[PDB]
Swiss-Prot record, chains A, B:
Keyword annotations of the record: Cytoplasm, Retinol-binding, Transport, Vitamin A
UniProt keyword annotation of Transport present: yes
Family annotation (PANTHER family): FATTY ACID BINDING PROTEIN (PTHR11955)
A Gene Ontology BP annotation from the UniProt entry: epidermis development
Name of the featured protein: Retinol-binding protein 2
Pfam families: Lipocalin
Top-level taxon of origin: Eukaryota
Subcellular localization(s) per the UniProt record: Cytoplasm
This protein's domain notes: Forms a beta-barrel structure that accommodates hydrophobic ligands in its interior.
Gene Ontology molecular function, alphabetical: fatty acid binding; molecular carrier activity; retinal binding; retinoid binding; retinol binding
Tissues expressed in: Higher expression in adult small intestine and to a much lesser extent in fetal kidney.
Role this protein plays: Intracellular transport of retinol.
Length: 133, 133
């Protein structure tokens, strides 16, 4: 068959390292890439192909009660120990991660179908916006 | 509303690189980590939160037509321009990617119920096998 439409989930990836090394890809990237399970979506119409590939990377859990300090270990980032405390500032969920970095925290709030998340550290601020799935 | 329950899919991420740099995450990691999208699942009961955040790598979509040589920029991988030309050899889709690297290309075919992708660069071959979802 020439019909390759579908969503395809990787079962094996033999010698991806050798191939990546032949393309001169740096060790930091190869070390992650070698382990990832890729999902490839092919939308094929005759001899036209539209593809995209995605791969899960990391999962992390954070659980807390508002107003109760908790220890957090930021493994999916910088892997530091912080003592985090979250409050409601109006309707915004506000967290301060107390530790070796000055001015570190995040704030999160809903406006209809959107969730806004602002993350800070020192003089830098990151803004992420999420849509309900 | 204080109700942030839900599954939330990232639609934008501004200045993640600055935030990471402020956290002292190394350049190599930021070049990678700045390529991730996130889904956040919030399970909230009053002031008690359980959140699970998952990161995903999403590559750039491609569109090609069998027979039509085109400029492919290999954003996911080694960030090179190659002149890719995909043809059918029987029921095997065969691609030669002309560029800096010799013998670089891939072959993709259905066998039984699985999709096989063989990627070559020089003397290195990577063999991926995917199952249909």
């Amino acid at each position: 068959t020439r019909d390759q439409n579908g969503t395809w989930e990787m079962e094996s990836n033999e010698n991806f390292e050798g191939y990546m090394k032949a393309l001169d890809i740096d060790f930091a990237t190869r070390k992650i890439a070698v382990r990832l399970t890729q999902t490839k979506v092919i939308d094929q119409d005759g001899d036209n192909f539209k593809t995209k590939t995605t791969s899960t990377f990391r999962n992390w859990d954070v659980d807390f009660t508002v107003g109760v300090e908790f220890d957090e270990y930021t493994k999916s980032l910088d892997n530091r120990h912080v003592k985090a405390l979250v409050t409601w500032e109006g309707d915004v969920l506000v967290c301060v991660q107390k530790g070796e970095k000055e001015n570190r925290g995040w704030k999160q709030w809903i406006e209809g179908d959107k969730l806004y998340l602002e993350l800070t550290c020192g003089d830098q601020v990151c803004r992420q916006v999420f849509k309900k799935k």
